[PDB]
């Protein structure tokens, strides 16, 4: 029974040695022979107003035209981007929401927050209104993220320090993923929806297999809480944003860090991270009211999206990659192009 | 230059906007309080006088109060404490009889120091609600106050032992230029607690109005 604190250290050292052996070059060394992106001039096209409190979440539809936003005023608003019209305004039982999602088929939406319950709302009903299709309970902490799989399974993460894959038809936890030692702040779904990564407050990220139900790999390197995560469009890498004013790129196959995006004049944490359609750009929302655009091959800042009067809380990019939506704490969403 | 079907979507959006404005106007006139404590310190009693979040709604003198209680949130406070940034006041509950603790008084002091000097509550008032004023007499007649605060030197009566914990709790305040701590000793089977909360809320609202007008 004395093997504790000694066997694990030796296996960790073996893993470190393997990672060091597999490292021969860096992304910068290979990429230094690539033409720089250059200055990126993105400007606002539509300003979506109507929320009366801080906006905490936002998600794009799969048709790249409709989006959903959630704020602390207990409202879930569905916007039509092209004409800035309001399609639906769902009132919430609990006005402490911290996340929202849009179903891939466009039939349902999901919400959750400090009430530890994930609510599923049905948008296409014969009665002509929006009804609460389901209320999933079982988490012991505030929900922080939720993502639909197809139309009947949803993945959620909470401050309980566990993740859960549900089954909306019966409302039961089909699978539970454990292993984090701190609150789980976000998750991202792989394009093939067979794996997903989760970033926790113990300065770690973990890659879970949805079908098997067990952790595959663990990634470390940050010095503080991770509160944003996103997959590369390829599906073999991801990016993390933390509270130490640093973004990082991790790779699944090499099981190693690739490059860190940081600057001397940035000292505030990152709230949201997203990629572009081609994966060349990397957009990160910051606490100093701004949103930076990084050339995610040389770690060179290549643009700034200024125009918000408070902290930028949510960030998203359409599937066709023709616009970027940023929602901030001043109750405003902006569509940059 | 809009089609017939496109001109009705605009009307629907305008109706949605009007309903949203009405809801916001209705909601902005409600007082919001955040209830905090060290656990089993009298919060249940205070709620009686008037999973996750627990909301209690009540009415006093045609004024609507919503009080938010966090008891099941046994997680990192710093990840969700910024949600309650616009609350009118923080009602802090402390037990006067927990000075012996077989200890918990120091934990309560640490919690009060962390909450009062937070970067989000720079200008949010705290209403102190020292409870259990009845058991204090017996507990101070049996055991002395010297067990807690060893630097204390005074009579063991309910005139020096009390009104000394209040200064100990108030001295933890660092921003004595934009906040104000209202301290009250909870009564027994009386409505004076709601009156005290009402007076503190009125003062906070007057100050907020004077800030808003620009004076």
């Amino acid at each position, epitope marked *: 029974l004395d093997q504790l604190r000694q066997e694990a250290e030796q296996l960790k050292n073996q893993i470190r040695d393997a990672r060091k052996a597999c490292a021969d070059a860096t992304l910068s060394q290979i990429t230094n022979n690539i033409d720089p992106v250059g200055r990126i001039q993105m400007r606002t096209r539509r300003t979506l107003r109507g929320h009366l409190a801080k906006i905490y979440a936002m998600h794009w539809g799969t048709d790249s*035209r*409709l989006l959903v936003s959630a704020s602390q005023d207990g409202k879930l608003i569905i916007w*039509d981007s092209y004409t800035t*019209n309001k*399609v*639906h305004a769902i009132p919430l039982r609990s006005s402490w929401v911290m996340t929202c999602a849009y179903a891939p088929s466009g039939n349902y939406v999901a919400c959750g927050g400090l009430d530890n319950i994930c609510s599923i709302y049905n948008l296409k009903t*014969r*009665e*002509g*209104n929006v009804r609460v299709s389901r209320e999933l309970a079982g988490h012991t902490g505030y929900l922080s993220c939720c993502r639909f799989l197809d139309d009947n399974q949803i993945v959620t993460s909470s401050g309980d320090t566990t993740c859960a894959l549900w089954d909306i038809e019966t409302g039961q936890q089909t699978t539970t993923f454990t292993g984090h030692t701190g609150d789980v702040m976000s998750l991202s779904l792989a394009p093939d929806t067979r794996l997903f990564v989760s970033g926790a407050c113990d300065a770690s990220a973990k890659l879970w297999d949805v079908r098997e139900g067990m952790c595959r790999q663990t990634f470390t390197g940050h010095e503080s809480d991770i509160n944003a995560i996103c997959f590369f469009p390829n599906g073999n890498a991801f990016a993390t944003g933390s509270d130490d004013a640093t973004c990082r790129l991790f790779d699944l196959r090499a099981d190693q860090e690739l490059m860190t995006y940081s600057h001397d004049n940035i000292i505030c944490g990152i709230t949201s991270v997203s990629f572009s359609k081609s994966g060349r750009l990397l957009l990160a929302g910051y606490d100093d009211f701004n949103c930076n655009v990084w050339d995610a091959l040389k770690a060179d800042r290549a643009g700034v999206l200024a125009g918000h009067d408070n902290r930028v809380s949510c960030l998203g990019v359409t599937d066709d990659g023709m616009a970027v939506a940023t929602g901030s704490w001043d109750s405003f969403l902006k569509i940059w192009n | 230059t809009l*089609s*017939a*079907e*496109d001109k*009705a*979507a605009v*009307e*629907r959006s305008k*109706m949605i906007d009007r309903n949203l404005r009405e809801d916001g106007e209705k909601a902005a006139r409600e007082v919001k309080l955040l209830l905090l404590g060290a656990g089993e310190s009298g919060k249940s009693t205070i709620v009686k006088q008037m999973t996750g979040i627990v909301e209690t709604h009540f009415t006093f003198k045609d004024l609507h109060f919503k009080m938010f209680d966090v008891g099941a949130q046994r997680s990192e406070r710093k990840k969700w404490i910024h949600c309650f940034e616009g609350v009118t006041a923080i009602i802090f509950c402390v037990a006067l009889s927990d000075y012996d603790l077989v200890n918990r008084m120091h934990e309560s002091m640490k919690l009060f120091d962390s909450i009062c000097n937070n970067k989000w509550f720079t200008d949010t008032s705290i209403i102190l609600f020292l409870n259990k004023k009845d058991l204090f007499e017996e507990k101070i007649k049996k055991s002395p106050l010297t067990i807690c605060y060893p630097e204390y030197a005074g009579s063991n009566t309910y005139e020096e032992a009390a009104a000394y914990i209040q200064c100990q709790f108030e001295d933890l305040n660092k921003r004595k230029d934009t906040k104000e701590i209202y301290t009250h000793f909870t009564c027994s089977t009386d409505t004076k607690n709601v009156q005290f909360v009402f007076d503190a809320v009125t003062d906070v609202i007057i100050k907020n109005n004077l800030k808003d007008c620009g004076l």
Partner: single-chain antibody, 233 residues
Framework: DVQLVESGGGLVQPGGSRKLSCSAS????????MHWVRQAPEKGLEWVAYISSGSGTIYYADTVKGRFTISRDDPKNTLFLQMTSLRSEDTAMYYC??????????????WGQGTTLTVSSSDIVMTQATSSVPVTPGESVSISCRSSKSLLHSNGNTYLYWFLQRPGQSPQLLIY???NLASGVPDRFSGSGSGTAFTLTISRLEAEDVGVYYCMQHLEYPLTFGAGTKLEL
């Protein structure tokens, strides 16, 4: 379930007055625009009047203006049509239709039942150059509708609707905006065509499909129907 029940029809002397009522149960009546649609005893359909949701938009069909008045009572979920100075050219059956307008919605989805009136004794035109076409169960049939002005707005939406009316039943929605299929309609129905020329195709025809097919436009608000194509045998 959704239900619209109409009442207030009967024999009327010429020049008199009448009131028709439509009671709605099973859906959010307050958020639906409502239409009154006529049909002469042996003729095709004809739009009559329209009232919006949260009444702020009212339209009449250029022949009842100044004689008909449309109103709604949301708390009791009722729709009223007051008709004055009735003449012999008003003997018809009246239908109470609902329609909700937002991005991706399906207007005209549910039709009422009908009340019979028996009064004693710029305008796009849609052409259906076909009256009757014999069919057999198992084959495929095509119905063609033709417009005078192109029904293609700059948005990219073509505003054409295809309705079916079975023998002795209220019409039901088949196709909206020239390509989309209404909920509950079997896959064998399809719709296509370009501006000024549209087609509806039925593959593997079977029973309970014989009836009259109507094409409607929704570009400029004096909505116009087609003559109607009847399938027999």
């Amino acid at each position: 379930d959704v239900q619209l029940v109409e009442s207030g029809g009967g024999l009327v002397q010429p020049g008199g007055s009448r009131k028709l009522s439509c009671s709605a149960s099973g859906f959010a009546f307050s958020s639906f625009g409502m239409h009154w649609v006529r049909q002469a005893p042996e003729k095709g359909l004809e739009w009559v009047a329209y009232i919006s949701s949260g009444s702020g938009t009212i339209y009449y069909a250029d022949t009842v203006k100044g004689r008909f008045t449309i109103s709604r009572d949301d708390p009791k979920n009722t729709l009223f049509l007051q008709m004055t100075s009735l003449r012999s050219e008003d003997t018809a059956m009246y239908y109470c239709v609902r329609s909700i307008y937002y991005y991706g919605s399906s207007p005209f989805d549910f039709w009422g039942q009908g009340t019979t009136l028996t009064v004693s004794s710029s305008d796009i035109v849609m052409t259906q150059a076909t009256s009757s076409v014999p069919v057999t169960p198992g084959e495929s049939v095509s119905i063609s509708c033709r417009s005078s002005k192109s029904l293609l707005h700059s948005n990219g939406n073509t505003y054409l609707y295809w309705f079916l009316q079975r023998p002795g039943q209220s019409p039901q929605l088949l196709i909206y905006r020239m390509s989309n299929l209404a909920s509950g309609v079997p896959d064998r129905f399809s719709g296509s065509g370009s501006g000024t020329a549209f087609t509806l195709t039925i593959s593997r025809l079977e029973a309970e499909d014989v009836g009259v097919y109507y094409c409607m436009q929704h570009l400029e608000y004096p909505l116009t129907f087609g003559a109607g194509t009847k399938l027999e045998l």
